[PDB]
């Protein structure tokens, strides 16, 4: 079992859940956030990566009668519903409401309380037509490898995400974002642009806290496994799906971490910093590092490319993107793969930022 | 014709697959059986296709005929007047009056959705729908037939995706059904792998299988005279092409080449509790190649182990990834999808399937 | 100028027209069933063998007004409305009835009468209904290569279009099939699997009667130009499009035919009968012939290929696609290309039903 | 301006307009069209090269408010119009008549008087669809490169265009057809069908008259450029766009002519005559002369390849697509492009012909 | 609310065409077709929406190109009685107790039956040539030029000005009273669209914000230094992102600016383009050659250099042809050296001569 009031007791206003699989954690958000959405003239958006994960998503039963049950319990009562039209009529406190399903929005009493949104078509949806939201649910924000093959996120995905958070929520301290992931693993850049790194002392803790976001692990619930049923015993004969459902935190991506003392090859000037790649010779081949100084201190001579034009000063060499490819792609291709060493899980983080920003 | 899946109901096990009799109108009469339940005991039904074009390409409009209510109605069926421009049915079941609409991917009775139509392509995004009351799962086509189809492929990790379909679908319900639908029937597939059955022809003679978690039937064509007063069918005989796939459910099964090979395997993965072996053995001509399957590593102390699962991987045990898989077990798995190596036993073979089959890649 | 009022009286239920092109072949047939799929609840599949060639067709102008007038004459009336629906009001025998098309259908009084289909969708629909259907017009049967640059047929495109006989009709005796063609030629596989093998004696005639089937041509009618019409003589002044109005059987494919005595290089068992392929050398290179043995007499030795799994036997070498694309690939490439010598036009068809049913592209 | 008044008086019913960029020759032709095709029962049909011309067409502006203001004048009253449904109301000598634009048809009164077809898709059409047409226009005959870059005729462009001449047209004496063209240049499809080869000497004459056809040159108006209009100012300071609106003669690709005495390397029989290549080895490379022979006179043993092959006979070799790409695949290129000598005027528009109608692209 | 971007000191200038440039996220074309509806709603005038591209349009979302919120905040208090039906994607609501319904259908957008917007491509602008528009005041072509960032390889159309200059011909018959609008999310030079206007944009330009010329008018927009509530942890994080954090401000990354110098030596060939010669001189350097790039507004001193003519109208003397297979067999690496700053120009002014010859002739 899984709920959303703990976290909307803090004031965080951000929240990471990872894990628990099969626990309806998006039945629970919504759930929880019926009231609002119902009664104190708020909307919701859903926010799913591609358009295929809501062209595909089944709009009418998004609210059920079953949640409706749950939530609003004995007060819930008179449920009559139309699924040819997408129409549910049903009764909250002897008042007559009816919640209408039309195209990607939800209506209850002719009121959108439901925004459906692909990350994908984000750049259209530039018109603020979104005044009342308050909740924002990204569900299945981490891309599960073993479920998908090849599935990839945007081009710099974190920086979409950031301009949908700006166009739905302005000026509006009343507003909660709900990150939903199945799987947890690093090397993505929902993590990137958050800035948590995931270790396995976090998933123990369960429950983590951060300046601007909360990160909750949710535990899968030990639900017996019913074998008179030949289905289940289907399923468990099948290792491959049985393990899918405790596969979350199966590989989290751990990166290498090393320190070396020689200076840089090669500095770019990002975000009020300089990230250098250090070259050591061994004689099996070469040993990257990668590193983050705050100040070019003994780094005198070293060439240093500037990405941003704007900022551009001194003895540094522009750095344009189909040149920044050229070059950096190779050492790019190094990061992705688990092939370097990082100084620490705090030069991590910024690496993965300068490499998920200008990834092509 | 003769076919239903009333003898089926009747047992036990509620998944069945059903191979052969091709063109006996397996779906249309596993619809119509189910329609009672349909209309008047709250359960909707999915009808399942590989492919978004397999739907695309459907005619829902016609899912459910006249002739069927007729036929599984009778009498109980009247006053039938339908608008098919609106594809709007309008008829009456015991003086009741009911209309059938289907719009885009349901079909709907009286106002509530009897019928879902989906695609296991499309299966992974909609992780996350709600199908309240699918007491049906009909999944057509389910072995893929080369000679209709030249060039079709099975999708990747295929029997995970319909497993979690299956949950999607079915959740906390214990009456559900879940009918498997082959004009062909062959090996090499992985629906075949996932259920664990081999087929061999011993089982067609028989006609009926029956199996723990589900049962296997056959449909053997009626031999029945053809009318040569009618010219189409004297065409049709004419062409062997046509005239052997009415046949053809059956033509060839895929069986694999099986020896033993005593010498330790070149290499080893473990998966399910066991560790998967396969040999190499030097001839003249070339290579010899043969599949093993070992229960415990006795003997095997040097030789390397791939491991798929990074949570249990452990000691020396080399990590599977799609790189890793591809660089070396890109030509092997080649080798077992062509019936180019040897198999121990049936047994090891369709523990093979399964683990191809799951990290296979296209 | 021709219609099948004529065919339908005739015992025969698949006909084969050929030639006239511009003649209305699709508009007369349609005319003529119209009776039946207003008025006998039976409906009627328009085929083609792309989806392009339905993509581009215009549905609506599928039924036209003029169409309703001369068939019906003075029993129709009252057709002066279009509503931007796709709905056609009109009356026949003081009847009100409304023709509305939409998407790949054509409704007429709220029932489907027309489906419009490609045969190389046809796999994907064999659970798709369809009740009353009572007429298959293939239309443009034959590739035209002059108006289609490259246009390929289906692979195994007779097997898949008997599949759809048997899909589109079930348990039907009352069922007519109308295959029409603009051009007519050899070497396709219609011709193959119908067992047609098409000479200029035949068109001669006009007519020809087969046991399961009737073909029909149609010659594109001698006409008197006036040249008094300036378009007239414009056309006249191109020869290209002079020649295009009687270019309907200019070549007809006619392929070699030739006998040679000495034993096949191999043989191919298919269809109760073995296929052999013969090389001679010659100083200039090899020359091919293919041959039909009905018994496997003095070719003991000889590899045999059999291309079904279920009948193989002995030392028969099993055809599959990559055997026989090593091997068959270049012959049958030999074969398109009137390239190789055959023993008789009854063993060229029979070449030919192997072939298609067997390549790839 | 511009009207086609004084054309429609003349004899000819076939007509081809170049120049007069921006001079509304579409509009002023429909405009003058209307008063038929109200109330004398006659349709028109709108023909463009490719369907995107017409997909991306506003089928619903085809006929506008101002245009029947212009031609109607006073008579022209009591206008209202639905923009959402295309549907336009108003009344012309107190009359109530209503214009709807559905599709590729556009009803006056529910009469159809406009069809809009795309040369490619004319295999698609019929001649039942077409009661009772009276004009035909082909707008943009001659393709602009400056305007669209990469623009392709169609294969046997001209043999398409006589087809749909004659499937729109049908035993019809009252028929006229107008061809219009921004620019007007040689080497085109249409101008070889017509016969026409466009020289500077005609241009000034600015009427030119043939047995079949009329052609008419407009110069676009050299009336000054108001300069205190920015629009107007901004173009005259981009010259590209400034020499497109005089580009209509700009550059009329005129062959290279020359004899050659020696008799031809090959020869192809075309039209009741045949056509030679001569190549004449000069120390550079190689010389191109393109020749027509009335008779084989001295050409005993040259080798003649015949494309048709109801008219093959003697020894001459059959042309088929395969073989013509081989030997005449790199001769249509030198044609194409002008490296090649012509014997005169007459001889090109022959070549022309037979180059367009085999072309392959 | 002044934050925002407006047209309104744009129109009450003279001039009828305007570039705006910058000021992403402003809402640009916003507030461009809010202060037009009064003219399409009541003024029976239409307007046009332009872009580049068909997927551009396709992927667009007409039915919000006008929005309740635009509606409520040009027509303030007269703005009343909004409601709309989502299947039908009509709009119903009040105006001064009017009743007034706007309808996106297709590629257009209706007002009470009468299309007021109109969505044009300029890839399929050229075969709309003989498209009629009765009553366009308004022209709107918008993300004139193409961001990198937000498109990897987006190209502009062959001779782009030429068919952009044709369609406002199309569009605009016989009217005075016509307003082209031209808006940029980023400014860049090297683009088609600037070197037909003849605007070289430089960054003393950028700081005065408002640049006049005799045909148009250049306005750069500036986005509104608004402040960050750090106490909200939605902005701490896109503070903590300097990607999004940039992308505000990057309007003006980078100008393309062109190096400039002068080379005294005759060129190496001439080319006859818009009354006047162009040539291009190599200067040959121990590292390897050097490319310069200059105008010559006379044939003095140049008797014996070859001079190529686009136009075969004005060809005469000794000049050599120039055709569409001659071109791309030396111009082709001439192009792709002008395309990037590889080479050497004498001016600005001759810059953007240059820049009109190659984008006219370019190919891709």
Known sequence: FWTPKRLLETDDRIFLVVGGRGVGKTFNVTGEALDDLFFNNVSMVYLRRLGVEIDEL???????????????????????????????????????????????????????????????????????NYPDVKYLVFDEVIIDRSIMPNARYIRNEFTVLLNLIETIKRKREDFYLFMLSNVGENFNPIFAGLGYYLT???????????????????????????????????????????????????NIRTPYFKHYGKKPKLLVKYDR??????????????????????????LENITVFNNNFDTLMEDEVFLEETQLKKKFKTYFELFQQNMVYHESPETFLEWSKFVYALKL
């Open 273 to 298: 910093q300089y990230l250098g790649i250090a070259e050591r010779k061994i004689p099996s081949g070469l040993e990257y590092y990668y590193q983050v100084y705050k100040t070019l201190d003994g």
């Open 58 to 128: 089944e709009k009418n039963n998004f609210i059920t009668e079953e949640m409706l049950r749950v939530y609003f319990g004995n007060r819930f009562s008179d449920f009559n519903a139309d699924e040819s039209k997408q129409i549910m009529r049903f009764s909250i406190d002897g008042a007559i409401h009816e919640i209408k399903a039309i195209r990607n929005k939800i209506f209850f009493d002719d009121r959108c309380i439901v925004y459906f949104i692909a990350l994908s078509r984000a750049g259209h949806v530039k018109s603020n």
């Open 200 to 250: 396995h002392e976090d998933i123990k803790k369960g429950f983590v806290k951060r300046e601007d976001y909360c990160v909750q692990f949710v535990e899968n619930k030990q639900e017996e496994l019913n074998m008179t049923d030949p289905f289940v015993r289907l399923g468990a004969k099948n290792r491959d799906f049985s393990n899918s459902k405790t596969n979350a935190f199966e």
